[PDB]
Amino acid sequence: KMLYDLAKKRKTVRRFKKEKPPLEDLIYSLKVANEAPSGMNAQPWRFLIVEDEKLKGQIRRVCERSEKTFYENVRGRLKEWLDEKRFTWRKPFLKEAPYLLLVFSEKSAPYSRESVWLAVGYLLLALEEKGLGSVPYTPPDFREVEKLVNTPSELRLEVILPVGYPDDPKPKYPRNEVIVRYNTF
Amino acid sequence: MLYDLAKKRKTVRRFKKEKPPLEDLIYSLKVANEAPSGMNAQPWRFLIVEDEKLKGQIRRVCERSEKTFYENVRGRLKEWLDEKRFTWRKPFLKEAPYLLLVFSEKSAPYSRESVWLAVGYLLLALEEKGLGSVPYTPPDFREVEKLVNTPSELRLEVILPVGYPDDPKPKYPRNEVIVRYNTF
Ligand SMILES: Cc1cc2nc3c(=O)[nH]c(=O)nc-3n(C[C@H](O)[C@H](O)[C@H](O)COP(=O)(O)O)c2cc1C
Ligand SMILES: Cc1cc2nc3c(=O)[nH]c(=O)nc-3n(C[C@H](O)[C@H](O)[C@H](O)COP(=O)(O)O)c2cc1C
Ligand SMILES: N[C@@H](Cc1ccc(O)cc1)C(=O)O
Ligand SMILES: N[C@@H](Cc1ccc(O)cc1)C(=O)O
Ligand SMILES: [Cl-]
Ligand SMILES: [Cl-]
Ligand SMILES: [Cl-]
Ligand SMILES: [Cl-]
Ligand SMILES: [Cl-]
Ligand SMILES: [Cl-]
């Protein structure tokens, strides 16, 4: 009934069915995202929809390689969190998802990154509305993925959003109570 | 429908005098708090500024910085601000009943990306609740941070004046999304 319910229900999806959602469902989510505010109304988001299996595999293996090295080297709170949740460098969802939605920011636009991540928040809620799942996937290095898809120098790959029908995704992680202070710290 | 909420939402830089109930802001923060974040760090922190003197200080600090910004701005930037009739004046920093300051946890991985994602949620929630907002980014964050005794571990991301809308200014255009497939 409420946006809160939609936001509450929405959780990471890293398990996907093979079945291809209608393009319109994914395009819907871009149309919602595109209504978002942005610095100087530049609308600095650009979308690349990757579906080609060979290309998905190339992207998967580049990310996995990058991740494997990262997993050898990560420390601190991130390592502790990844270890406890038994994450590894393997990223099968980059092949299994029917879409990889690559989201780029226009580097030259003011507050381009802030604006695109804001729009991604819109986008994720829209996907949830359509019964699609995703995960903001951010490999350690984006340069090689950018090269794989011939990214122009003007654009920065922000995130890989695998999108598909969820396949019994694991439960939402907890949320701490929101932390609100008044007037000053 | 979510598209309707997103499509209708526009910037609000002019607010009614009446103060909305705090519940509606808190609702919006609870929505934001449901957003994903890198390693589920939930790296957002919120400061609600209501005190009139403090809002005034924030307003004055930002305006002084904007004055300098506007003295010097040129090119594309200048043309857009001119055509939209922006000036260094930011009266809504004083006149909005609430300034919602959004901070990111500097040390949290993916903190900036996560907080701005959550700001997306937040803005939709404010719209749902019938409130207006503008993501105001001051030219000098540090001066504002000091005004509210920001701890060194936090980074101010954005000032969101929040109130009942009183802004007739129409939403600016949105170009149709043009997608690409597989490669550029
Ligand atoms: C990251 C970001 C920073 C912004 N900074 C400012 C700002 O400093 N001053 C301002 O008046 N509006 C600011 N805005 C609001 C934009 O100008 C506004 O979102 C854009 O004009 C589109 O407005 P509309 O949704 O009503 O079409 C900012 C928006 C974003 C997303
Ligand atoms: C900026 C950002 C980057 C993320 N990067 C990754 C990632 O690289 N790999 C991954 O599996 N999940 C990634 N996530 C998903 C988070 O792990 C997830 O949002 C968090 O665990 C909360 O999940 P939940 O909403 O299901 O509770 C990312 C999320 C955000 C916001
Ligand atoms: N921060 C400046 C410039 C600005 C305005 C609107 C924007 O979307 C971005 C930047 C102002 O408020 O006037
Ligand atoms: N990118 C790495 C590490 C990571 C995992 C989850 C996150 O939320 C953030 C980072 C992975 O996908 O395994
Ligand atoms: Cl997620
Ligand atoms: Cl415009
Ligand atoms: Cl950049
Ligand atoms: Cl899952
Ligand atoms: Cl806005
Ligand atoms: Cl957790």
From Swiss-Prot, chain A:
Record-linked PANTHER family: IODOTYROSINE DEIODINASE 1 (PTHR23026:SF90), NADPH NITROREDUCTASE (PTHR23026)
Protein name listed in UniProt: Iodotyrosine deiodinase
Biological source species: Thermotoga neapolitana (strain ATCC 49049 / DSM 4359 / NBRC 107923 / NS-E)
A Pfam family reported for this protein in Swiss-Prot or TrEMBL: Nitroreductase
InterPro entries cross-referenced by the UniProt entry: Nitroreductase, Nitroreductase-like, Nitroreductase/BluB
List of residues binding FMN: R10, K11, T12, V13, R14, P37, S38, R175
Its biological purpose: Catalyzes the dehalogenation of halotyrosines such as 3-bromo-L-tyrosine, 3-chloro-L-tyrosine, 3-iodo-L-tyrosine and 3,5-diiodo-L-tyrosine. Activity towards 2-iodophenol is weak.
Effect of M40K: Decreases affinity for I-Tyr and Tyr
E.C. number(s) listed in UniProt: 1.21.1.1
